[PDB]
Amino acid sequence: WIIRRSVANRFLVLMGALFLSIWGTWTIINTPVDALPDLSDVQVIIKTSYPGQAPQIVENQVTYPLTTTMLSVPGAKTVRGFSQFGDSYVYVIFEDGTDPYWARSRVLEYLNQVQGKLPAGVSAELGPDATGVGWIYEYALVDRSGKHDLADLRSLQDWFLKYELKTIPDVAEVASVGGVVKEYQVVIDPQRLAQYGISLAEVKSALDASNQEAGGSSIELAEAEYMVRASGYLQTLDDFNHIVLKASENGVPVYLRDVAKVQIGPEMRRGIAELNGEGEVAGGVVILRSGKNAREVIAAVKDKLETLKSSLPEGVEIVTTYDRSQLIDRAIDNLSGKLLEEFIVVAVVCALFLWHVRSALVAIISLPLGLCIAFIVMHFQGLNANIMSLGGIAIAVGAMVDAAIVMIENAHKRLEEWQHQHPDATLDNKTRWQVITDASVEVGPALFISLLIITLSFIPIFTLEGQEGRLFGPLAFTKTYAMAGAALLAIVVIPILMGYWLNRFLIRVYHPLLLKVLHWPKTTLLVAALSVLTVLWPLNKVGGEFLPQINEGDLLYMPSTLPGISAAEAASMLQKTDKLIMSVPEVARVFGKTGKAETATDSAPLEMVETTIQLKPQEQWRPGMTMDKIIEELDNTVRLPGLANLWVPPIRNRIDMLSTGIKSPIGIKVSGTVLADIDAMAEQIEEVARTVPGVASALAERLEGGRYINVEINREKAARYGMTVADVQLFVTSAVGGAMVGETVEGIARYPINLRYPQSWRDSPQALRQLPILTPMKQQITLADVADIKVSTGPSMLKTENARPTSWIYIDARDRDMVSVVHDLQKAIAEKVQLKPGTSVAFSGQFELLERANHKLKLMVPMTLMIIFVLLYLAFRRVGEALLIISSVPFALVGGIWLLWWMGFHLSVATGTGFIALAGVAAEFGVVMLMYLRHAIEAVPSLNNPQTFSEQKLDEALYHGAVLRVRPKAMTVAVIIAGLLPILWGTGAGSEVMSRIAAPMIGGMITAPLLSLFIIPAAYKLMWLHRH
Amino acid sequence: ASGVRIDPTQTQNLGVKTATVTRGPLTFAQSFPANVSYNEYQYAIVQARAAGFIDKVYPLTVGDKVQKGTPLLDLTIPDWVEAQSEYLLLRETGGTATQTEGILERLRLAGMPEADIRRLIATQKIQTRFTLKAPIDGVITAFDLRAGMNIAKDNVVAKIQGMDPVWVTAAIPESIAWLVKDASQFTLTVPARPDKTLTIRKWTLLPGVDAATRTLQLRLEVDNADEALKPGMNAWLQLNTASEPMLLIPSQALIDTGSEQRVITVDADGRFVPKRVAVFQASQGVTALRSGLAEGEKVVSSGLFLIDSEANISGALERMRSES
Amino acid sequence: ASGVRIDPTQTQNLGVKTATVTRGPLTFAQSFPANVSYNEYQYAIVQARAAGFIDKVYPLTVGDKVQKGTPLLDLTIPDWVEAQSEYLLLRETGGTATQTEGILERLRLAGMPEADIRRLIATQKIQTRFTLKAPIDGVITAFDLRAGMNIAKDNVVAKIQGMDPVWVTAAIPESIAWLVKDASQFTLTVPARPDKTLTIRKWTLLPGVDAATRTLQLRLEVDNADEALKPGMNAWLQLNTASEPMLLIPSQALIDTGSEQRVITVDADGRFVPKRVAVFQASQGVTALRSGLAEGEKVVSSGLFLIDSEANISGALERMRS
Ligand SMILES: [Cu+2]
């Protein structure tokens, strides 16, 4: 075919690979780099602050009508909902491929037509460009000198760092976390309001007119423009104190300082941050734009900090609590090292089989070029250098040379004939020209098509919808890129390069059991199918997991607790836990967090905690300590009553939340239209889940465990004193509550101002009943005179998903395998827990992800077999031929299973991939095996058979085909198993998934050839007899 | 087996603290606003005994403090002359002592002050010009007679109000009424004088409530010899009141879910066991139960929540309810 | 089942902002609102000694400045006529030298002015027309009689109050009664006159404070010969002073509830230990303590260690000791 038009292009093709190598060495250095192919789902959130209003009224009015005007949005997968106290979180997730920014602009116009069907004081705030997974850099601000405090640090963070960082490109948002926002607290004396005859309402009003500036236009003096500026900003405590409330004719006024003390104090603390269980601190998380480079940004951040490390107030040091750049480095500085393994190993192994230095060099220059073509393609494509993109350029390295050697081999022996018929001392350039080309032509069709096979039989993987398709997608692209590259190049350069430039003691161990296989060939096939069934058994033992448990240097610790906890107590609980975590000698830093950080990405209650755990270098752990053995001491050392604790990877979780929302690997969703029912169903499942053989934690967040002190105002009682429902409430919100009334304007910054009675008056329900009230008519009463105050229980966090209430059960199993527990749960649940009417129960988390992948994989196997069927049919044209190879691949699959069992691995989409690619390599072996047998029939001895039968001639054509393969095979099944062997053993940062995807092949690459050395042959002598 | 067991090393890390159930009265505490005002038993309103005109008006206006004796003004009262010259001429023609006494009597019960009469007898001279002086120590709150005027009976030359045993009246909201009882303990403080510890001589709960404000009036008489308590000053009155002897526990130790209230009892072995109690009242950091416990019993106060949670999750709570 | 232990008490080792208890003075610097008014020791209400009718009233009215002697009005009083005859008769018939002093003294008790009696003896003619003059220099703040009217003894022909030693009264907040009692000197300043500003060293603190605006009343006299400071003018009373040495601590250091003020002190080891104190009074961002701390103790200047929302102070402070 094309090999003919190849040699003619002997010249400018050489420079075509020279400028390809020098341009392939440039693109490689300047390729973006990450740890994984961004696996996050496209989302757009809508945070709203409906101040005061209880959860229920927040749901019905501000939240519900949003998830229903969002669900019916073009390309919306699912919409989750969050109705906390004074906070509304609408989560809108879109379907695969849906342009993020498109969805954004859609949410905006939808937000325009619902901005009206919402309460007056509400404004739907649009979230950031990034998601929770965009949490790259995290740091805490500490000052041991004491010169600065939590207030000063937060201010430093909000008004300096946050600004010096947000201007870093590709950064979507720099959120602050923890610390203290200084608040101007005007604490009012209920008594002085009576003594001075000034009402609360009057105070608020006065304050609301003592803190602004005014423009008096301009005035022309000396032909110049003089601007009339009027002061009036509230910038001193005295300015607060001398706020006029009341003035007599005498000219003697009554200032705010007469009925209140103006003191500086903390504001409502949203979230809380604690470091190493020995200090509460402020900090900030750097959140990276949706699809931008995670590493490229961290570096720009570090240097930006070193620029500020001098301009920081003497005493403030920036400790770092989470650095994703470190995992990046330990991931890329591993896939690189493993590409050096297979490279030098395959080259050396092909050097011990090929005696010639220039012969090996030809199959050696087959990698540097197969490399370049893979890169210069990814740049055009739009692919960065991550573990799953290099893992593809690593899983494929074995066949790249398998494209070069199988050609070279046929020329090594095709040159041994011209020497045995012709002399040995006369040869020229044209006589050394013909020999190599002839050999390349005979192996031209078989290989190129079989490499078009390996890359098309593997094509079906692209159909993997969503996260896994985002994972193995790049690996799919990269494997195909480098394969098609080492295939199209093997017919353009390889032949010319090879033209320019103990095998005994295995052929003696092979044929004894080969000539033996020709003892009633039929029987050997049956015992082979029988071995396939014995090799089928191991399946039962192996476990099931959506993906290998990848190990990052750090890990998040979230312990779930009942709904009611108080902020102060949660903060206490937090620091306590930190000190325990810091007790274990493998962890270097502990960055605890309760509540949320200043970002719509984090909507966590103070009752829920997530602490980032940094671990000392993997080479400092105690003797026989593993990541799993570490967590054991953690889950055994860190544990307080009424608290269930879950341990996860940082990155994994932010993605586990964006795809489903569950924190844990295992989770159960109990949706319902009556909270009392779903909460009843969540508790029962919580009890059954904790009796399963391999569970550690089981807690289902309640849906109405919130405590209430409600002030049921009496209209008639209030009217007595000429008070409206509104007038009474003013005390609830501002007197009793810390309601904000304004904010100071301090330069670029801004701080809140609030009115409130001293704590003692609002200490307890009893207290609220004797809450001093100065009525409009200057009468002195207590709050209970116009209202009843009752304690009650109710909703704590109205959670919705598709506008349907739901509770999540967080299960923590890590000693067993996922699929085992999830099934043992399906059995435990669906037998002991009788479902109630309007209550639904369904598993989620990573299991819901396995059922999406397995439905794809099962509708992805037939089609990969149909393509293999047509590639065998196009190159051989024989039905029975194709059939025989299609029936041979199962043997390769079977062998790969034992290695999983031995290695103790599990069934993953990682492993599942290894088998699809393994089958593509099995049929790659199956064909190059047949071409030796079929062309053994083209010879004269086998031309004698169709004319007249011969029991001797048929066995000799097979014996010659067997020898015609033991050389190729010994190379193919060498470079593959030997090249893939390095990236097999677990140990390695990210290798966790690159081995699960390698074992299937390696294990199958042993019994695929070893078996298909006797199967296919003893079936071509049993299929040749039929037609005759 | 009601209750729930918990590894002590966890409770210790939780920093669990426990309190012991006792019995006694619950000291109610509450603060009310009060006014420093004049003593209304030190009330003098000087009025002329008879008509005349003002000769002298001493340096004195409304707002000044006058000591008992301070001269207010000088006036000429002629009404008593006819009866005086009749006495002095009888003194000439030596009349009977009874004829004399009878004239110094028509003088007495006709206005003339005893002191000015004692002066008539001592000088045998007709008294015409008189000096009106402050009858008591106090502050002048009214002064309607200046120089150049005529004075009348109904005219008020000086309203003098005292403030030594100074009054301080506190306003208690009517609904609370019950909190102030006989045995109640009071303590005063005046913002103007943070350095002065006041002494309450006695107190009274007036018979009626101020309709203008809907508050009962509580009057305190307070030693004020140094005159540090000027009328008009704000004064804060804090009262304490013992209640009926009740079971007493700390307030952090009590859980209330609006339909039931309970506390976590620490067993003899350490087994945390929840128990239903009935609250009666609570104030100043301590709640009083009407029933549900027994003096001696321990009750958790620190780490209460988590322990209640653990006791809730372990079905101990649902057990506590179904056993009784 | 780990026997591993941990300190449950709250902890803060990542730096704390501390200050030390210092014995010193509370410094003050305030401007009291004051007013200029008439001298109420220069008062005069002119009434007739006996009823009659106004013959003529001189060009005068309220708001006018009069000096002693300024004629107010002329009136006819026919109450002393009957007796004036009785006297003049004692002259035509040489009555006793004491019968005359009699009629002449009953006449002065009758109300007839000492000067109008002399004009009787001199002219030897009965007096019916009299003229009332201003008794003192001052301003006519009232003038109730005009021409064509009659007159009674309750009527007021002139309410004349002066202002040479003019009065100024300042309203000092109840709060600093403990301080102003032992004041040294105030500095008077009136907006109407930037040149009439002067130091005041003698004043009188009244025994009563105003209720509407809970304020002490401080009155002082000022020389006003040139009639500069007119009554009705605003004025300011400045006070720069410092209190007796007391235990001082930063204001942000005192954690005060509605009934419980206290401060968190850093001991010799650096451990947080909350103590109950008693506050006297603050000034300029620094409160003075009556009792609770020692002179030199360390105390953290922050109520910023308890979440505002609802860090139940009692509970939160207890989490720091054990
Ligand atoms: Cu979470």
From Swiss-Prot, chain A:
Gene3D superfamilies: Multidrug efflux transporter AcrB pore domain, Multidrug efflux transporter AcrB pore domain like, Multidrug efflux transporter AcrB TolC docking domain, DN and DC subdomains, Multidrug efflux transporter AcrB transmembrane domain. The chain crosses the membrane at residues 11-31, 335-355, 360-380, 388-408, 443-463, 482-501, 517-537, 856-876, 883-903, 913-933, 970-990, 997-1017. The keyword Cell membrane applies. The cus system plays an important role in copper tolerance under anaerobic growth and, under extreme copper stress, in aerobic growth. Belongs to the resistance-nodulation-cell division (RND) (TC 2.A.6) family. The cus efflux system is composed of CusA, CusB, CusC and CusF. This is Cation efflux system protein CusA.
UniProtKB/Swiss-Prot annotation, chain C:
It comes from Escherichia coli (strain K12). GO terms for biological process: copper ion export; copper ion transmembrane transport; detoxification of copper ion; intracellular copper ion homeostasis; plasma membrane copper ion transport; response to copper ion; response to silver ion; response to toxic substance. The cus system plays an important role in copper tolerance under anaerobic growth and, under extreme copper stress, in aerobic growth. The chain holds residues 79 to 400 of 407 of the full protein. GO terms for molecular function: copper ion binding; copper ion transmembrane transporter activity; transition metal ion binding. The cus efflux system is composed of CusA, CusB, CusC and CusF. GO terms for cellular component: cell envelope; membrane; outer membrane-bounded periplasmic space. Part of a cation efflux system that mediates resistance to copper and silver. Induction: Transcriptionally regulated by CusR in response to copper and silver ions. Disulfide bonds: none annotated. The gene is cusB. This is Cation efflux system protein CusB. Keywords: Copper, Copper transport, Ion transport, Signal, Transport. Belongs to the membrane fusion protein (MFP) (TC 8.A.1) family. It comes from the Bacteria.
